[PDB]
């Protein structure tokens, strides 16, 4: 049985070949379902208005006129 070790050692890494090929299949395929399940999450999301600036109040405070309608002081977000 001393050549039993011979035949099997190639059988192993020959088999790991497809598993990396399948670990590609999964993760490449998982990121698909991520998007559509992310996208669909937020078409349920609300609208978003549009408007124009008049000036800026001191900081973390500006004003806008919604182009059909009146004024609305606001705050801002982290980024801007």
């Amino acid at each position: 049985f001393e050549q039993k070790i011979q035949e099997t050692e190639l059988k192993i890494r020959s088999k790991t070949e497809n598993v990396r090929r399948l670990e590609a299949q999964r993760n490449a395929l998982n990121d698909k379902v991520r998007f559509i399940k992310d996208e669909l999450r937020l078409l349920q999301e609300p609208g978003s208005y549009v408007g124009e600036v008049i000036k800026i109040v001191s900081d973390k405070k500006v004003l806008v006129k919604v182009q059909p309608e009146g004024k609305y002081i606001v705050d801002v977000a982290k980024d801007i």
């Binding site: 001393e2 192993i12 399948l22 379902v33």
Partner: protein, 40 residues
């Protein structure tokens, strides 16, 4: 010669047990796919 090849057997039996987990989940996963790109 007679202890080393005992190891090489059991690492294989490890490997085969996960070769189906990676597989069957895909068989389990895809049922969510159309289940989601139908809700769209």
């Amino acid at each position: 010669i007679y202890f080393k090849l005992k190891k090489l057997e059991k690492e294989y039996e490890l490997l085969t047990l996960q070769e189906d987990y990676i597989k069957d989940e895909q068989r389990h996963l895809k049922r969510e796919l159309k289940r989601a790109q139908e809700e769209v």
